[PDB]
């Protein structure tokens, strides 16, 4: 019935400059009617290959498509940071059109310690009744990172959420935000807000903090 497209590997982490190949096997004969697409973190999808080996005119030469019987491959001759993305093959020999499960292509790079920044809540937000304290871990690698919050030296729990970006297209690093949310009352009753960051790139935890009294600067 429907043609199943088995894409492998599901995740492929590779060093910069490495030759990498993604594979898609069709459960049926697709006679070279295989399509490859790239989807960047922002959701943008672009055609890479069609007819199994025909390269889209707007795609760099490092990309190539090949067929080995029932096995179809997408190869990147030398991995570049901007190749970080999700890749999918797509059979169009018959209907329904079916896609491979995709491959998340991750970039291995050197360790990079994060730059840590802290932001006190804006007075504008305070007038609202809630206070958001933002801690930023910028451009680090690997992704593994620990962020803890301390308010007047007391470790916080359950009142923070973090978000992490996908690897940067230019330097393959990650950035992470940790947001501490408190009521205005609670924010005003405490003084020292500290963000403690632990990361492989740091020999010892990095603590960035501010005194609400000093505003969030040097008053």
């Amino acid at each position: 019935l429907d043609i199943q497209m088995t894409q492998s590997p599901s995740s492929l982490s590779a060093s910069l400059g490495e030759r990498v190949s993604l594979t898609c096997r069709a459960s049926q004969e697709i006679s070279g009617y295989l399509y490859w697409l790239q989807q960047k973190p922002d959701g943008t999808i672009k055609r890479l290959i069609y007819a199994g080996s025909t390269l889209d005119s707007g795609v760099p030469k490092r990309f190539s498509g090949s067929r080995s019987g029932s096995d179809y491959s997408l190869t990147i001759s030398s991995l570049e940071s901007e190749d970080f993305a999700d890749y999918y093959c797509l059979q169009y020999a018959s209907y329904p059109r079916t896609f491979g499960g995709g491959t998340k292509v991750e970039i291995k790079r050197t360790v990079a310690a994060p730059s840590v920044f802290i932001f006190p809540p804006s007075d504008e937000q305070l007038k609202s009744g809630t206070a958001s304290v933002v801690c930023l871990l910028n451009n680090f690698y690997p992704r593994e990172a620990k962020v803890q919050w301390k308010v007047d030296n007391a470790l916080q729990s359950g009142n923070s959420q973090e978000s992490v970006t996908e690897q940067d297209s230019k330097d393959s690093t990650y950035s992470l935000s940790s947001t501490l949310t408190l009521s205005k009352a609670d924010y005003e009753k405490h003084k020292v807000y500290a963000c403690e960051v632990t990361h492989q790139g740091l020999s010892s935890p990095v603590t960035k903090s501010f005194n609400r009294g000093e505003c969030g600067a040097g008053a």
Partner: protein, 217 residues
């Protein structure tokens, strides 16, 4: 070069939604429009095609006939209507224009559909002011906290698109309140803080909210 797709929409479960896709220029050549579905963080699923030329259509049986594709040959616009919506229909829907000789040549940006009973809510935009607490060396980080909005998405640009380098707009986080929040930050030269203005341009189409917040040190 991409196609044009209708904006993000919030629709209630049990309702229906109709989105559009059309080529930018009036390029009136007989093309085929392929529609693809993608749930947040998941893979791609073919929905069906509409061939405006002869009205030909074909649907992935997995949609159980809930998807209907139509087109306006006059405007070369293709429409995908999804009925009896449920949360499973919350996803980004893409259209691709193609032909036998030029398969999946162009892709649209996708239309984000959120099926929910919750009402839309525009975000509040707060500055993440640069200070000695966000300055390392000659680099200062600043940003905007786009808080309490629903549904996704919000778009954030800096200085009307003039500032793209060093910008990190984080994935939205669903708060316990059921509202989303995200921060967009950017690192800039600390020496520019006194001369260069930094404004985050936030737009939340579902609530028809457009806010330009200047971030001061």
């Amino acid at each position: 070069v991409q196609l044009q797709q209708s904006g993000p929409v919030l629709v209630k479960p049990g309702g229906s939604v109709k989105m559009s896709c059309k080529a930018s220029e009036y390029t009136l050549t007989s093309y085929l429009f392929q529609w693809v579905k993608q749930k947040s963080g998941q893979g791609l699923e073919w929905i069906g095609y509409i061939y405006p030329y002869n009205g030909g259509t074909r649907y992935n049986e997995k949609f159980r006939g809930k998807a209907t594709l139509t087109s306006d040959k006059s405007s070369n616009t293709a429409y995908l209507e999804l009925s009896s919506l449920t949360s499973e229909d919350s996803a980004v829907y893409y259209c691709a224009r193609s032909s036998m000789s030029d398969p999946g040549a162009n892709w649209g940006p996708g239309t984000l559909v959120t099926v929910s009973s919750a009402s839309t809510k525009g975000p509040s935009v707060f500055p993440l002011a640069p200070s000695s607490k966000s300055t390392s060396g000659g680099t200062a980080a600043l940003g905007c906290l786009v808080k309490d909005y629903f549904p996704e998405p919000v778009t954030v640009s800096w200085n009307s698109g003039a500032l793209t380098s060093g910008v990190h707009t984080f994935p939205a986080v669903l708060q316990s309140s059921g509202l989303y929040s995200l921060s967009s930050v950017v690192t800039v030269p600390s020496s520019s803080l006194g001369t260069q203005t930094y404004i985050c341009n936030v737009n939340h189409k579902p609530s028809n909210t457009k806010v330009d917040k200047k971030v001061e040190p």
